[PDB]
């Protein structure tokens, strides 16, 4: 298992398409301990014409789905290794979200840092925690408990 | 008590593809906030969530359920004021207690029911469920703070 | 029933085309209850019009033309995935078709068709779209199945 | 005041993206007929659902060009060239009749709108026409909309 | 061929919403030179955002789609219409030179791209031609590509 | 006159709003002379539907484009400096293309830096060149003249 997988990997292994796929690089991870990966925010996002008109703010929710997405990256390939064709069969979903925390508007230009860690995991079932930061700074905080299922 | 998107859209800043509230069924200032939000296949957000199954988002949902939260929390202090509503904004500060039971689909008519579980000043905590036919899809509690727009 | 996950393996229409969210009703070579559900967040209200939602009386009939179809897909050949791959639909004619009252978001779109005419490919349908129980608009109409 | 652009367009009719379906007017005479046209490109995002790998222009937003195309005729006939008194007026369809499509619509086609004025009175326009491709009839339709201040 | 329609393009090109910039081929020879055009709508997204209340058709996507000329026409000089030997090349553009634009492009318009094989040495192809909007020359450019395996 | 704008100091400047505002940030700027500028570029872009499938590449010509703006930034506040009001009055137009290379494709989790300095200069007409990189690598070349003129 490599430690950084670029946008064409994570499209092998996440099911997520545009536009709700909100994670774009994986630079370190640990199977079974953590990941960590972002997502640039750039004005070019359908989101801003909503969130907020003159006013871009990236949308708390979708942070904590970016959040939710690489820990379902690193609960997969913590089982499997990199298998695009196991990982075509399964797919994560949220079951809890708990003590979310929002710290630090996220705008146009950010470069979107996701940082989870495994605090517990049996089988399908994994518990994940950690936050999401721009250059160094804790801009939203959050824990969540995902099972890998069957797609169908 | 019953308000419809066009009330909507002169409370809420939020705007396509983000505003997740279609209608206001009730309404009890203080107290709590009955609407909801249709989901059909024709949005956008289906093209990758996910494809060749469509399912409304988890956060999705959550949003939608804030976004209740605010209109209630707004219009209690200052009823339908657009006027006003423009110089205020309602950001959310944290959420906690979520729980997704039920995956919604199009078809659905997302329900959101919150309740004031306390507020102080500006800052306001809300908690409540999304329903489907009577079914409780998903749970959450939130504290949102609301403030002057910049 | 037959949900969207059904409704995608008969219908050829997609985003943002693909106007019918469930089939409620069906009943081969006789009618058809259907709906879809209108909510602000489609794309389409961006532009009809700003600050004023109104679902397109046009799209309105698109729908029923739809759910036109996947009864006539259905009568033709029943629930056959493999076969409605092969096929796309063509309107042919529209006639008789008055608006009575606007559709908005919030509103649950039912269309009501019923088989007037069907002879090999072509079937003609007429029938209602309704809001709550009432009727927002009638229409009749003709379309042709083909081979891709 | 007989050839119009997008600008004068988009300054009388309340449509917007991606629901304004005429690009150009060729020729108007008031309360009478207008001759109008909207390119048709690949690039547009309704032939990501219709159909895929099979492009096609629908049918009901071929019966919305010309519904617009009237509307435009209906507006100028009315008040003239005037976008102060536009900025605030709607238009809802009425009815449809006698529609009949006769050539599918592709990308690369210059779809052209010919309404003739059937019947008017007060808000309410009555128009009927064709819509063609290089000179052929690719639909036929008849149709009454209304023209409605917002309230 | 010498025509070719949407079909036939997206057979060819890789190219889809909303980069696929080329609608129709009305003339083909083989290594000499193509003519071919994309109809000009306000129903294209890019219009929201160049300009509101000015649409003017960006004069980068006018290269680009006599890139893609180029390309179709590169292709099926090596391989004529073979929408399978398609799916294994790709052609990087390397450079883009002596572009000038003259004509604003809008809605209503129909772009018309003259291309004509200007070099080819091996993988290398450097073509050179104009847009053109009821006959006048709109906007001119060069450019060079080279093919490879996808 | 400042040195960095943010998206909201670029909304009340460039007359580009979506999908063809490409400009997040800007990270310098000299009056007449040059700036440094940037976009993030991420998966959750439009674009990328087209190009391509199943290989998220941005489009050269954007590159280009996104040059241009930033030009177009620098030209506007060195004749009035950051003035929203005259900014409205305005659109730019692109008069000339030379010069261009495109030495690495740019991808998700980019972030698209342009560096331009003004070659010349008079009235309205501005002409720029410079370069587009990444992790301080030049991505892409260009030479491009545009003009600012009134609305109309
Ligand atoms: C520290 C902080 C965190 C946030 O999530 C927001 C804000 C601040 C914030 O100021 C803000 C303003 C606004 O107009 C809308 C928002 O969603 C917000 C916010 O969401
Ligand atoms: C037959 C064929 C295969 C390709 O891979 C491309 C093209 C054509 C092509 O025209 C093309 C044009 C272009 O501007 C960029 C591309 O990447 C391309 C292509 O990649
Ligand atoms: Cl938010
Ligand atoms: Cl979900
Ligand atoms: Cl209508
Ligand atoms: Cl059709
Ligand atoms: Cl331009
Ligand atoms: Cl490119």
Redesign the interface.
């Known amino acids: 298992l490599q430690s950084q997988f670029?946008?064409?990997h994570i499209?092998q292994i996440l099911?997520?398409?545009?536009?709700?796929?909100?994670v774009?690089?994986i630079t370190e991870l640990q199977a079974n301990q953590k990941i960590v990966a972002?997502?640039?925010?750039?004005?070019?996002?359908?989101?801003?014409?909503?969130?907020?008109?003159?006013?871009?703010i990236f949308?708390?929710?979708?942070i904590?789905?970016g959040m939710?997405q690489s820990g379902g990256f690193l609960a997969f390939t913590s089982l499997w290794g990199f298998d695009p064709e196991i990982a075509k069969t399964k797919?994560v979903?949220?079951?809890?979200?708990?003590?979310?925390?929002?710290r630090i508007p996220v705008?146009?230009?950010?470069?979107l840092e996701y940082h989870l860690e495994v605090l517990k995991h049996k089988g399908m079932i994994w518990q994940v925690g950690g936050t999401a930061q721009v250059d160094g700074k804790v801009v939203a905080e959050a824990e969540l408990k995902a099972m890998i299922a069957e797609?169908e």
């Open positions: 670029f946008i064409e499209l099911p997520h398409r545009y536009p709700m796929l909100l774009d690089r972002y997502k640039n925010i750039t004005f070019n996002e359908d989101v801003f014409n909503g969130h907020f008109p003159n006013k871009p949308p708390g929710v979708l904590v789905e939710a797919i979903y949220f079951m809890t979200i708990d003590k979310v925390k929002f705008t146009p230009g950010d470069r797609r």
